[PDB]
DNA sequence: GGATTACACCCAAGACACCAGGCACGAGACAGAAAAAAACAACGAAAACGGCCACCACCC
RNA sequence: GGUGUCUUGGGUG
DNA sequence: GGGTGGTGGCCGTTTTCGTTGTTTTTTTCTGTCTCGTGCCTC
């Protein structure tokens, strides 16, 4: 159990929008903004 | 003991039985009282019929030949008691 | 009164032990306000406008808590709901164009909204 | 009390008609601030009415005028852009049953 | 011996009713034979999972073992509300 | 599933009993026969295996059953 | 953790009685079983033994009588023999 | 269903704890004994219950 | 000498 | 006709109370389990 959540913590630090499953939220409710999502899209840092 | 458990038959006796019969190191509290309570249950089926059939036979005493009728006329008494000679119980007609 | 009525629970062994409340009627009433003081008064859209407060009405439901064992609650207070100007539970629905003159309210607003902080 | 109170409070104060914690999943922009730039821009918001589409697919066919809407909304008041045709404003004999 | 439980049982079940001597010999047999039964099954279970104490719990899975179909769920109720009783 | 105890495997099972001829009527008295049996020992080991708080039936309960049921089986307490 | 059988022992006596011949591990286990039932047959009647006497001590006398009891004829005298043999030399 | 539905730009108004059950301290519940008044077995008696006898009715 | 972050809604081109 | 299924009186014998010898269950204080409570997170 404990190096699971390990493993999803150490997932969701990285990349945040894994298919099928929750995903790592904040304390007011909003998602995490993970590396990938720094790095992705129109406002991410490559077109950004 | 047996007044607080609602039995009749001793837990305290039972309790000791159980920690001088070489059955584990330890004795449980509730052991005793659960065990007493089998045997009274069973005693008291097998006195209801016997005693039915002593009324039946119109004495007021019960004899071994009741116990055997009881017993054998029983489904489950026949099967727990399968292995048991009862002396002087003769068998059913 | 959708859902009317709440019940726990417990058997073992043996009392059956049932703890059961009833909602009741709702009350409504006009918009107060109350202060650090605790001193209160009646509140209007002028003054909540100013002061950053919430136009709202205290709602109280009546809860009446039963219990019954077969061997085999006050006007609580809810919540505060904001009211829309203009409407029948509004301060502003009575009082004629001069006392709402005399209130600061613009005769030719027409109310339809409310007053959230 | 201060169940009810914050969440009526919190889904008229910011729009998302739902649970705080669940602000996403939940319809947003259901409350506004009122528009008192001038008086009739106050009447017509009074009056909005929105169809909760979404921008994200290119069907025209909600986004149009249609013959039934003679006499319930208005035929020309719409935004441009990404609005238009999902936002209507009510002619002026129109009503709402109870 | 048990006999003065098992008469106080029969006073019970039947107020009238009394035993013959040879009969009783028969019931302390009885009750001698299923207290062995009970115990050894009891023993075992305990045994076989390691654990140093007999508690109820063994007690009611070895009656589970030993008695058929209505003696076992009978017996297994009175015990449970034995224990039960006592306890409170 | 009773029935995936086909006739030819209680002809085999009777051959080693030494059976040279079977009337019709026995593979299906021997299936009863055979239910009861299994109903028998599967019944106290799931009971061993509840009493240990196990999901998995061992094959040292099924033993102890067979033990306690007079049929004591050589070749599994490994 | 440690796991134990009476393999190596059934081993060595195999190889006394046989040494060109080997066994099976199915037959071993076989053996085991059968070590082990003994076992618990004889100190179960010597626990009897005992409690019967009112002795709070089981002895090489309670397993003399259990072996008497549970094993047949000559092979209870056989069994006998080895037992009071192996006592009598153990204690010299 | 990982994406994503043009670019730049302007201000309205909102969260800034979601939450229980993580780790350690202090208050209930349980196990350990024994002398003394209470329970079990023992000494003796009682009419009451069971087998026998005087006397009795029925069938293949 | 150092004037913070994200979403919702309404517009301009 | 030879048993077996009934009626009523008399004799054996007997297991439960009156009462006690012998054995016995546990309350309070102390040392372990177990839960309530406080700080912090294409």
Redesign the pocket.
């Known amino acids: 159990e404990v190096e699971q959540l390990l493993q999803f913590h150490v997932a969701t630090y990285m990349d945040n929008?894994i298919?099928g499953q929750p995903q790592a939220?904040?304390?007011?409710?909003?998602p995490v903004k993970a590396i990938r999502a720094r790095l992705?899209?129109?406002?991410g840092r490559l077109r950004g | 003991?047996?007044?607080?458990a609602g039995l009749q038959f001793?837990v305290?006796?039972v309790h000791?039985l159980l920690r001088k019969g070489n059955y584990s190191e330890r004795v449980?509290?509730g052991a005793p009282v659960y065990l007493a309570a089998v045997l009274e249950y069973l005693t008291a089926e097998i006195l209801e019929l016997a005693g039915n059939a002593?009324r039946d036979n119109?004495?007021?005493?019960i004899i071994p030949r009741h116990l055997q009728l009881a017993i054998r006329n029983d489904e489950e008494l026949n099967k727990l008691l399968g292995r048991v000679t009862i002396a002087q119980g003769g068998v059913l007609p | 009164w959708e859902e009317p009525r709440l019940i726990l629970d417990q058997p073992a062994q043996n009392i059956n032990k049932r703890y059961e409340i009833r909602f009741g009627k709702i009350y409504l009433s006009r918009p107060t306000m109350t202060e650090a003081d605790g001193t209160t008064h009646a509140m209007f859209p002028q003054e909540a406008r100013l002061r950053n407060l919430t136009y709202s009405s205290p709602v109280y439901l009546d809860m009446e808590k039963s219990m019954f064992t077969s061997i085999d609650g006050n006007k609580v207070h809810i919540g505060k709901v904001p009211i829309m100007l203009r409407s029948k539970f509004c301060s502003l629905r009575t009082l004629d164009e001069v006392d709402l003159y005399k209130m600061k309210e613009c005769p030719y607003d027409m109310g339809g909204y409310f007053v959230i902080? | 009390s201060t169940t009810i109170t914050s969440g009526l409070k919190?889904s008229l104060?910011?729009?998302?008609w739902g649970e705080?914690?669940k602000?996403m999943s939940s319809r947003?922009?259901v409350s506004?601030?009122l528009?008192r730039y001038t008086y009739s821009s106050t009447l017509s918001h009074l009056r909005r009415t929105?169809t909760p589409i979404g921008?994200?697919?290119?069907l025209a066919k909600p986004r149009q005028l249609h013959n039934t809407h003679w006499g319930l909304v208005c035929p020309a008041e719409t935004?441009?852009?990404?609005?238009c045709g999902l936002?209507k404003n009510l002619s002026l004999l129109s009503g709402i049953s109870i | 011996?048990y006999?003065?439980?098992v008469?106080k049982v029969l006073k019970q079940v039947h107020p009238?009713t009394?035993?013959?001597?040879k009969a009783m010999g028969i019931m302390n047999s009885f009750v001698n034979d299923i207290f062995e039964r009970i115990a050894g099954e009891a023993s075992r279970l305990a045994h076989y999972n390691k654990r140093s104490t007999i508690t109820s719990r063994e007690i009611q899975t070895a009656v589970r073992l030993l008695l058929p179909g209505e003696l076992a769920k009978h017996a297994v109720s009175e015990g449970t509300k034995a224990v039960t009783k006592y306890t409170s | 599933n009773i029935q995936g105890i086909t006739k030819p495997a209680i002809r085999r099972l009777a051959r080693r009993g030494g059976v040279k001829r079977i009337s019709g009527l026995i593979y299906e008295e021997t299936r009863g026969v055979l239910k009861v049996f299994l109903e028998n020992v599967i019944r106290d080991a799931v009971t061993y295996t509840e009493h240990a708080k196990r999901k998995t039936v061992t094959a040292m309960d099924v033993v102890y059953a067979l033990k306690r049921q007079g049929r004591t089986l050589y070749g599994f307490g490994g």
Do not use: F, H, M, W
Request: proline share 3%.
């Open positions: 929008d298919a939220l904040q304390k007011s409710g909003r992705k899209g129109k406002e | 003991r047996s007044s607080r001793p305290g006796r000791r449980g509290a002593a119109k004495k007021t005493r | 902080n | 919190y104060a910011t729009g998302n705080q914690k602000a947003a922009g506004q601030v528009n929105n921008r994200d697919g290119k935004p441009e852009g990404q609005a936002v | 011996s006999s003065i439980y008469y009238d009394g035993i013959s001597s």
